[PDB]
Structures are given as C-alpha cells and as structure tokens.
C-alpha cells in the first residue's frame, strides 16, 4: 500500500506481487529495520508481522546473490585456446451416473 | 470463529436444513454490526459479514465484495476477536472444564490475553528462514574464494 | 579511413596496417554502445545524433566488405564479433541491424574457429530480446519476420564452402551446425527455468520457419524443418525426459503438422534440368541486383549434388544417367530468361515435392497416434488437443479407421481431462460441418452423464451452439428435455443452464 | 618461440577487466547483506524483551 514501509507490509502479507525489481535495492535494511523499532504507536502484533516481512526480504536478497555468483563462476571457467482399448474404465459404471426418477 | 470449520465433509453435508420439500444446497449466515466507535478499522456505519456455504464452495462476503479467507482473519484479529480461542464463547454444559483445566492451557490462554500469540507464531516461522539464509551465505563465501 | 582501405579491388600489400583497424573498431564500439543506443532506445537509457547514426551505418557496411577481402588476426576478431552481435538487442535500429547481419555473416564465413563463440554470445542474451508487439518483426520479405531468425538462416546457409569430397563434407558440416544449434535451443527452451521462460520465443521461431518454408531465395529452411521434426519425435517418445518438455514438444509438432497440411490441401489441389537452370539463372541475375544470393545459389548446388548421390544409393543405365546429371552439375559449378517470382516459386515447389519431406504429414499422424496409449495424463490430453486442431483445420480427416478407433477409445477413457478433450474435438467437428452430424449425435448425447463438471459443461455448451446455430434439426425436443433435466445437478452448471 | 607459446589463452584481457569489476560489485553486495543480518538480530532481541 502506501508508506516507506509498504514493501515490508506486502512481503509479510501477500508476497506474490513483490517483483525482482522491488526486492533488490528498494529498501536499505540497516535503515528501515532501524526505523521500525522506535516508530510511534507500534503495536506488538503489527511489529511481529513486520519482522517476518523483513526476514523474507533478506532471504530473497540472499537467493538472488547466490544465483548471480553461481552464474559468474560458471562463466569464468570458459576460455578460448585455439591450439486400441488400452486403459478404458470397465464399461460405463465408472462414469455414467444414472438418471433419477 | 474459525474453529467450527474443521469438520469432515459429512458434517458439512449434515449442516443444512433438511426439513421438508426440496433439499437446500446453499446456506448462508450474515451478521451486521456497527463500529460507530471505530473499533473495527474499515470505516463504515454498519459493517456486514456473511459466509455463503455449499457442499464445495465456502466464501466470505464483506460488504458485497469477495475476500480471500485470510484478510478477514487478520481484520478480525485487529478488531480484537481471537478467531481460534474458545474463550468468551461457552458451550452448553462445558464451563466447568475452564476451572479444572491443567495449568499449561491456562498459561496459553493468558499469553493470548496479553496479545502476544501472533508474534510468537511469526517469530517461530522466521527462525527457519534465518537458518537457511545462513547456509546460503556459507555457500556464497565458498564461491567467492573459487 | 575505412573507405580508403577498401575501395579498390586491389592495392599493394602493407598499405593498411592493423593499428588503424583496431582503432576504428574500438572507436565504433565505444561511441555506438555509449551514445547511440541510449538516445535511440529507452531500454538502455539532436540532428547530430541522426548524423552520427548514418555515419556508423556506412562504417559497419564498409568494414564488413574489408573483413571479407583480407585475412586478419583473432584478437581483432573478438572485438569485431562482439560489436557486430551487439545491435540485435535494442529497438529502433533496423538498418544498423541488417548491416550487422552482413558483418557477422562475413566473420562466420571466413574463420572456422569462432562459430561456437558466436553461438554462445547469441544464446546467452536471448532474454534481452525486445518481445514487444510493435516493432517485433522488422525484416521485410506485408509478410514481416523476426530478426534473429533471419540471422540464423543466413548463418546456416553461409557455411557451404564451394571450391570431390569437399561438397559432401561441407554439406555434412552444415547439417551438423543446424542440428547442434536447434538441439541447444530446444533443450534449453522446454523445461521451466528460474524467473524466465523460452516457450514463447521458440513458438515465434517456429511460426517464422513455417512462414518462410519454400521461397526461391531461402533454402535450408526445409532442412531446419526436417531436423526439427526428427528431433521432436525422438524427444517426446521415450519416458526418461521430464514432463513440461514433452508437452511443449508435442505442441510444436502439432503446429507444424497443421500448417503443413493446410498449405498442402489449399495449394496443390531433362525437364528437371531445365527447371534447375532457369531458377539458377534467376538467382544469378538477382545476385547483381542484391547480395547474399550467392550463398543460397551455392547451397542449392551442394544440395542437388548430395541428392544425386542419395539417388545413386537409393542400374548402369541410371548410373550413366545420374553421372550425366552430376557432370552437368559440375558444368554449372564451373560456369560460376524471363523467369520471375511466382514462376520460380512454383519451380522450387515442384522440386520440393520430389524431396522426402512433403510426404511426412502422414507419418506425423501415425506418430501422434502411437502416443495416445501411454501412462501419463498430461501427454494424452495434449495429444488430443493437437489432434483436435489438426482435425478442425482439414475436416475431411475423420475418415481413417485408426483415428476413429483412437477418438472412440479416448472418449471412453478413465480420466475427466482426456474425456473433455475428446468431446471437445468431436463437438468442434460437429459444429464446423453442419450436416453429416447425424452419425455422431448419439455418441455425443450419451456423454451428458459423465460424473465430471468439465464434460457436462462442454456438452451443454456444444448443445447450446447447435440449438442456436442450425434450428429445424430433428433432435431439438430431446436436447431441450435433457438440458432442462440437468438444471438441479450442481451450482456452476445451474448458473450456465439458467442463463442459457 | 611461437611453438613454445602455442596454447595461450586468448581473450584474457577482457576476462580480467570485466571479472575484476564484477567481483568488486559482488563483494559490496555481500558486505551489505552481512550488515543487514546483524541489524535483524538486534531488532529480534528488542522485540523479545
């Protein structure tokens, strides 16, 4: 929704609309999580929700970093040194639910 | 209360008026209450919630727009309803057990009364993810050395 | 500098030292990739810009020609190849794109050690293609086609090497190149990868191939189609592969069978040497008009040669006859009116109708029908849908007895998915041909009582379309009675019957 | 002397420049992720209390 913490809301509630463009550099962890702790009138419930949100964000960042690193390492190992009736249900009793009267 | 809808399909089939004439297939229960004090957050004067039930379809209509069975739960949580707690709803002849209950259950009841149950569940869920990112970070350092 | 180095057909040696080569190359690389693409395309990111654009087009064309003339050193070649592969991945650069086609195909022609590098640098960045409806297909041929497919066709046609055994082994190299490229593409395409798919890309590639199947001036397209067919059928037959790849492969085979049969049924319904001569002279004139035709001509030559060899293999009378064929082939190789577009098209159509590809459709059907008895549900569903599409293209194909027994068996099959697929086929066939449906009505209207929710809805939709489309049908009353009979069966079905 | 240096790895220079730049990027990303982890643990302690 709306706010400098909407991303964490989404990551804690819906998580599907959150795109690979959002996750990467939208939120500066060391600043946003720091913002969450002294924020005015924060209920414990919503705080727990936000905790799961920020942890999911961080986990996704880890996933992407691993994927890109693996891609790079696979690249670097390259070089160029030039030197009939088969299965029918038995009759119709399987699927021929009879008409009522 | 969510707890009721944990029954077998037979019970759902048996939870419909089978009195006379034809046999129904689409029962529905609606409740209209007023959050004039804005205890419930969504601003209206008479919030309406109904639960259409059929043999296969189970749906929540909140002011004539469909919902997804989770948004409504978090909404009711925010209102103050505890969707899973037997507390403040006492079935006929089942009050005595709240006194002769073993201690641990009463502690869980009190912990919920404090409003620290959802936080506990979310933290318990988050710990696993944390451990898996630890494994991931180990792998990343390995690959950097390579 | 790049015009002065090239312009004469002949100069003394050492009048152009590799330093100016390297300089102009890196210059175009940096200026292009850092000034042109950002201002011409918002993906990466006044009159002086268009001026520089025109300058770069002239540069790359002249440089292509220069690279064709003399030999060069691989270190320069890596830079040139990277710069020439670059333009295919921004938006509004069409003319630059086809000059880059020229450059890359010259590089692919001369040096037979960088082919793998160009294939990798194409494959790596296939995600970065435009895939926007506007400006997708910008290589004229109405009738536009995609770009990287034109590049692929040009490449595969390029390596022919027309000078004995050279003709044989060169055509073998061509076949190996095509098989390798296509195998890599399809295998990387099928399975669902992380965060991105390839199936729409491959679908567009195959739609393109079908669009350019038999023209006078694009051989090797039928070669790609043949190898594609054989690869697909050897790909989804066995039981070792994954699932989604089998699904996608069977889908592609269905598409190609449809287009093949449809163009067939709507098109057709020493003389060979004279035809070859006429078509070849047409091509010869068009070389003068427009380049790149030389590769096609040499390809036709090599293919006629290998076809004569295969006719030898499959007598002394026909041995001498084919040696006269081969001798005339040698004559025309050594030699290196009034026929125009439609005429040449019909000529190559006939010569193709001699080749062992036009008689493949039959085979294809048989192959699909081997699939229908198998032990995976999704595969049988897709077989049924592809067969349904085939049938609804050419409605006079529900005649062969094997297809009859197939669709009956699958109509009685024990899984609601394939049952609804079969009834959908039969329903579309009945709706298409208004009459001649009085033979399938009984086997159709038996299916209302079929214990799913798919099949019931499908039969009700088909019945509704009948009762709207062609009234005065005899069985109207019974149809109305049965549809009213099912009013209380379910909820969604209830809504459908009520609104109908 | 050419015959001694036959099997040389061409394209080495581009490899070097590009992969060193990308290694720089990856190191910075990893450090940021580490600082974030520390921050998360701090918040978890505050919430528990």
From Swiss-Prot, chain A:
Protein name: Double-strand-break repair protein rad21 homolog
Residues carrying Phosphoserine: 37
Disease per record: Cornelia de Lange syndrome 4 with or without midline brain defects: A form of Cornelia de Lange syndrome, a clinically heterogeneous developmental disorder associated with malformations affecting multiple systems. It is characterized by facial dysmorphisms, abnormal hands and feet, growth delay, cognitive retardation, hirsutism, gastroesophageal dysfunction and cardiac, ophthalmologic and genitourinary anomalies.
Species for this entry: Homo sapiens (Human)
Positions of the UniProt region annotated as Interaction with NIPBL: 84-101
Subunit structure: Component of the cohesin complex, which consists of an SMC1A/B and SMC3 heterodimer core and 2 non-Smc subunits RAD21 and STAG1/SA1, STAG2/SA2 or STAG3/SA3. Interacts (via C-terminus) with SMC1A and (via N-terminus) with SMC3; these interactions are direct. The cohesin complex interacts with NUMA1. The cohesin complex also interacts with CDCA5, PDS5A and PDS5B; this interaction might regulate the ability of the cohesin complex to mediate sister chromatid cohesion. The interaction with PDS5B is direct and is stimulated by STAG1/SA1.
Similarity annotation: Belongs to the rad21 family.
Cross-link Glycyl lysine isopeptide (Lys-Gly) (interchain with G-Cter in SUMO2) mapped to chain: 39
Tissues expressing this chain: Expressed in the gut (at protein level).
Post-translational modification as stated in the protein's UniProt record: Cleaved by separase/ESPL1 at the onset of anaphase; this cleavage is required for sister chromatid separation and cytokinesis. Cleaved by caspase-3/CASP3 or caspase-7/CASP7 at the beginning of apoptosis. Phosphorylated; becomes hyperphosphorylated in M phase of cell cycle. The large dissociation of cohesin from chromosome arms during prophase may be partly due to its phosphorylation by PLK1.
Domain notes per entry: The C-terminal part associates with the ATPase head of SMC1A, while the N-terminal part binds to the ATPase head of SMC3.
UniProtKB/Swiss-Prot annotation, chain B:
Outcome of mutating residue 57 to A: 20% loss of sister chromatid cohesion, no effect on cohesin complex assembly
Effect annotated for changing residue 57 to R: Stabilizes interaction with PDS5A and WAPL
PTM (free text): Ubiquitinated by the DCX(DCAF15) complex, leading to its degradation. Acetylation at Lys-56 and Lys-57 by ESCO1 is important for genome stability and S phase sister chromatid cohesion. Regulated by DSCC1, it is required for processive DNA synthesis, coupling sister chromatid cohesion establishment during S phase to DNA replication. Deacetylation by HDAC8, regulates release of the cohesin complex from chromatin.
Linked pathology: Cornelia de Lange syndrome 3 with or without midline brain defects: A form of Cornelia de Lange syndrome, a clinically heterogeneous developmental disorder associated with malformations affecting multiple systems. Characterized by facial dysmorphisms, abnormal hands and feet, growth delay, cognitive retardation, hirsutism, gastroesophageal dysfunction and cardiac, ophthalmologic and genitourinary anomalies. Cornelia de Lange syndrome type 3 is a mild form with absence of major structural anomalies.
Family: Belongs to the SMC family. SMC3 subfamily.
Subunit structure comment from the entry: Forms a heterodimer with SMC1A or SMC1B in cohesin complexes. Cohesin complexes are composed of the SMC1 (SMC1A or SMC1B) and SMC3 heterodimer attached via their SMC hinge domain, RAD21 which link them, and one STAG protein (STAG1, STAG2 or STAG3), which interacts with RAD21. Also found in meiosis-specific cohesin complexes. Found in a complex with SMC1A, CDCA5 and RAD21, PDS5A/SCC-112 and PDS5B/APRIN. Interacts with NUMA1, and forms a ternary complex with KIF3B and KIFAP3, suggesting a function in tethering the chromosomes to the spindle pole and in chromosome movement.
From Swiss-Prot, chain C:
HEAT repeat residue numbers: 358-396, 434-472
Entry's localization field: Nucleus; Chromosome
UniProt note on tissues of expression: Widely expressed. Highly expressed in heart, skeletal muscle, fetal and adult liver, fetal and adult kidney. Expressed at intermediates level in thymus, placenta, peripheral leukocyte and small intestine. Weakly or not expressed in brain, colon, spleen and lung.
Family, per entry: Belongs to the SCC2/Nipped-B family.
Function in brief: Plays an important role in the loading of the cohesin complex on to DNA. Forms a heterodimeric complex (also known as cohesin loading complex) with MAU2/SCC4 which mediates the loading of the cohesin complex onto chromatin. Plays a role in cohesin loading at sites of DNA damage. Its recruitment to double-strand breaks (DSBs) sites occurs in a CBX3-, RNF8- and RNF168-dependent manner whereas its recruitment to UV irradiation-induced DNA damage sites occurs in a ATM-, ATR-, RNF8- and RNF168-dependent manner.
Disease: Cornelia de Lange syndrome 1: A form of Cornelia de Lange syndrome, a clinically heterogeneous developmental disorder associated with malformations affecting multiple systems. Characterized by facial dysmorphisms, abnormal hands and feet, growth delay, cognitive retardation, hirsutism, gastroesophageal dysfunction and cardiac, ophthalmologic and genitourinary anomalies.
Domain comment as written in the entry: Contains one Pro-Xaa-Val-Xaa-Leu (PxVxL) motif, which is required for interaction with chromoshadow domains. This motif requires additional residues -7, -6, +4 and +5 of the central Val which contact the chromoshadow domain.
Protein name, as recorded: Nipped-B-like protein
Protein source organism: Homo sapiens (Human)
